[PDB]
Design a protein around this nucleic acid. Sequence first.
RNA 1: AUUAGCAGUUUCGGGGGCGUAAUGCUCUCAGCUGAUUCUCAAACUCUGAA
RNA 2: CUAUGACUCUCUUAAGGUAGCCAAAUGCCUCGUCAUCUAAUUAGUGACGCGCAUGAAUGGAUCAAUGAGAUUCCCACUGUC
RNA 3: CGCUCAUAGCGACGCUGCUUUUUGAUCCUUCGAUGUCGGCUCUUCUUAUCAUUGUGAAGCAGAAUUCACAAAGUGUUGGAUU
Lengths: 217, 50, 250, 51
Amino acid sequence: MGRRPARCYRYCKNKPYIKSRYCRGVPDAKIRIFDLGRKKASTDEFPLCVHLISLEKEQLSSEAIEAGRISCNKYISKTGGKDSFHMRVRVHPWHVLRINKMLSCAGADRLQTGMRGAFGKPMGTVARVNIGQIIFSIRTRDNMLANVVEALRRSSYKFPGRQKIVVSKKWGFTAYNREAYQKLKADGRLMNDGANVKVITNHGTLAQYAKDIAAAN
Amino acid sequence: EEEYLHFGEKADSENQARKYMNAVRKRKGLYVEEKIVEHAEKQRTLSKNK
Amino acid sequence: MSIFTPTNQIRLTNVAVVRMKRAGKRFEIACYKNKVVGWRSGVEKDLDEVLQTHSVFVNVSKGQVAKKEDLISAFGTDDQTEICKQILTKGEVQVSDKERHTQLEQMFRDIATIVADKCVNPETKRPYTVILIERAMKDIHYSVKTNKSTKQQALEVIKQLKEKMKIERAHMRLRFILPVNEGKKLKEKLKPLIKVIESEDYGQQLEIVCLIDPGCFREIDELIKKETKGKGSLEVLNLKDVEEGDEKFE
Amino acid sequence: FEATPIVRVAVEPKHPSEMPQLVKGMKLLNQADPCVQILIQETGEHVLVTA
RNA sequence: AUUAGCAGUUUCGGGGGCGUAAUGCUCUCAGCUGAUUCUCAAACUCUGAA
RNA sequence: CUAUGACUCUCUUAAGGUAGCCAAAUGCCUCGUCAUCUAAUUAGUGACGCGCAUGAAUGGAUCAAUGAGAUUCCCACUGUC
RNA sequence: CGCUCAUAGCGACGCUGCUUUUUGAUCCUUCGAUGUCGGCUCUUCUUAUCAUUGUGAAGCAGAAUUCACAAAGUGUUGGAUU
């Protein structure tokens, strides 16, 4: 929250609140967008994925996240363009912060500023992340690695604390490694989904089956 | 600004060209800015397709 | 005793106090001085920004928090945020000095602007200038008032400016159509009293007249008519900026 | 001789009480320095013009 | 609670290109459905911890 | 549009501030706005007045004289330079 | 942005600190009584250095200004109003 300094919340503590029929008075999240570059990009063309991870367990503010995304969206353009970056962020902010206001006071107090009826009102939407939990994620072509790591690097400045950058060993937004991705093409088990792969697999949820190979093929 | 976001230069707006046409109207001027009355408004009462 | 072991003290606020008396009960709120104006100017900056506190007081100066019965009775509701909002919209608002000055400044401009709408016409391409009038106003000195409307103020002060001297404003043609019998009578009284032009008496084709006013003195010209003959067959009203056909008066 | 683009400028009173003086002065200038629109106006009360 | 594209629709929604124009196709975009994808929901929890 | 509210509707409770007066020993905002006084004035005085919350024997407005009363300025005052 | 040119000078959204010269929060200390606010007086110290000493940058030509290091050695005013 831009009112407060975020020192106030960069440690993952207090069991986690949410939007609900119970917490109605929340503001709207800062980021309401997780769409950076060419979303209509096939899975069989952008074989690289890089990831950014919070080194530290902590909260991660919505505003901060938003700020980060335009280190990967100004920097989308100067390097490569829209035909390299596909980002789903990979964290949202469900968690909320309260504010027991005593700003009331700037000269005296009414005493309601005190800890009677202490409980704060919703003010500041925010994410919670462990050390592994991933926070940015660019699926891309493998002629763009140093020109996307520097986006991630830039973003890292705009997160509290320590942030590790990495490249995985997969085609990005897939379980399956680059080694096991070529299998799919080869063995006739690649099934496209405009973004994802379903990957054709024999199984039985029927009575006597043979369309389980002949369905998607 | 939606239109601008498509982008084919900036025109019919505040520009390099509007430097010359910013507020040269008023050299004290005929009026404060522009006073005019019209009876072309209301298309239904006039009964026009124009 | 006080003198020995703390002689005690009092404490002053620096927060705006938006106040409204409903049902003979003062409700007040906690806001800041340079936000409470900005709210009303269409700068929706979250309600939680303008409110320093979300609660209602009988008196926010001392700090007497307001009561549920009092609230519901006076507002038709006990929910406080809504009430606060209402107060912000409706009630008197304390302001700083700078803020106050801004309003005054605005008013000053306004009273010049209103004078500029219709100004002295040798042809119809000369003055219509706000600045000169404003300057004149400044240099003559008169109390600019927030209780007083702008138009009224202008009316008041133009007279003063007249004997500076400086000629101001231009007249327009508020046109009428009188009856055959009463029109003549009207003409008999209205010719030397005020300026009347485009007069053409007839037996069959009625009588047309054009009483001279700027729009801001249309009560005086009509009153006499009302007294004598009542309203005309048609009563033409034109705008208070231009006379519909270009001004040539004064 | 006036200009080909018809170059104009907004001549204004510094003081409101000096307006009459200003008005007078343009006329005076007219004889010494040729051509100004003090009377017969296309734009404004008065504007200075040159070649 | 909530992110994404995909496909199958269009006598149901809207606007274009294709015979004048559509919902006839094909598009971005509405709605619905199907398979996949993001974050799992102190007052959710099929499971279940010393 | 009036400054204001005589007025007309309406509600509350019977009425809705007339004469006057005013940032007053009564004005939150407030160091109000303007003029003056001072090189400069949150001070003073005179103007303005929808007056947070003035006002007619809860007495309103005025005021000569009077005052170990309260405040401002000027002059005589200069170790209260 | 600074024409142009991210960092001469600034610096978004964003992020981390320090400070105790603001005000709150708290109620440990004091109700066998630390005399509460300002002004005068007078020293001391701190530096987050306004001036001056010496230095280095500048969109520093000169002029003046701006930015920064070392450094607290010496200065740091007269009045109206409150």
